[PDB]
Ligand binder design. Structure first.
Ligand code: HEM
Length: 154
C-alpha cells in the first residue's frame, strides 16, 4: 500500500500537535491500551503489577516508556513510508525478545486513534482519521512481513 502526499500531510499535521506533549500523549495511549486490553499488560514484566489507572498515571517508568514508544513511532511516520531501516531492529526485538503478536499492534493502533480523536477533534476529522489508519495499517503490514522473515509472524 502507498499513501498520497495529501494523506501524509494529514498524519504529520496531527502528529505535530502530539509532539507538543509527548509524555502526556504516551501516558494516555498506554493507559487506554492497558485498560481496554488487560492481556497486553502481562507482556511487561516492569508494569505487570499495576492494578489501577491511578497507579499507572503515577508510574514514572510507564511515562518514560510512553515517550520512548511515541518517539520511535514518530520517527517512523516522518519517513513517510521509507521506514525499512527503522523497522528492522523494532521487528526483531518485538518478535524475538518480547514476543508480541500482530494482534496486539492492532490494539495499540485503536488506542492511538482513540486518544487523537479525544484530544484533537479539530485536526482529526474523518479524512485525517482515515489517513492515520492507513499509515498504521502500512506499519502493521510491513511489521507482519518482517515477522515472517524472522520466523515468527505472531
Ligand atoms: C506503535 C507500536 C510499537 C512501537 C513503536 C514500540 C516500540 C518499542 C520500543 C522503541 C521499545 C524500546 C527498545 C526495544 O525495541 O525493545 C519497546 C519495548 C517493548 N515493547 Fe514496544 N512498541 C510497539 C508496540 C508494542 C506492543 C503492542 C507491545 C505489547 C502489548 C509492546 C511491548 C514491548 C515490551 C514488552 C517492551 C520492553 C519493555 C521493557 O522491559 O523495557 N510493544 N517497544
Amino acid at each position: 500500500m502507498v499513501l498520497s502526499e495529501g494523506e501524509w500531510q494529514l498524519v504529520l499535521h496531527v502528529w505535530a500537535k502530539v509532539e507538543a506533549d509527548v509524555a502526556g500523549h504516551g501516558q494516555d495511549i498506554l493507559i487506554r491500551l492497558f485498560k481496554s486490553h488487560p492481556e497486553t499488560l502481562e507482556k511487561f514484566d516492569r508494569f505487570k503489577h499495576l492494578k489501577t489507572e491511578a497507579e499507572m498515571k503515577a508510574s514514572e517508568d510507564l511515562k518514560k516508556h510512553g515517550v520512548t514508544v511515541l518517539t520511535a513511532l514518530g520517527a517512523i511516520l516522518k519517513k513517510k513510508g521509507h521506514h525499512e531501516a527503522e523497522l528492522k531492529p523494532l521487528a526483531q526485538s518485538h518478535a524475538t525478545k518480547h514476543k508480541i503478536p500482530i494482534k496486539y499492534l492492532e490494539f495499540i493502533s485503536e488506542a492511538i486513534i482513540h486518544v487523537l480523536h479525544s484530544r484533537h477533534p479539530g485536526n482529526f476529522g474523518a479524512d485525517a482519521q482515515g489517513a492515520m489508519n492507513k499509515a498504521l495499517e502500512l506499519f502493521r503490514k510491513d511489521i507482519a512481513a518482517k515477522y515472517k522473515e524472522l520466523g515468527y509472524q505472531g
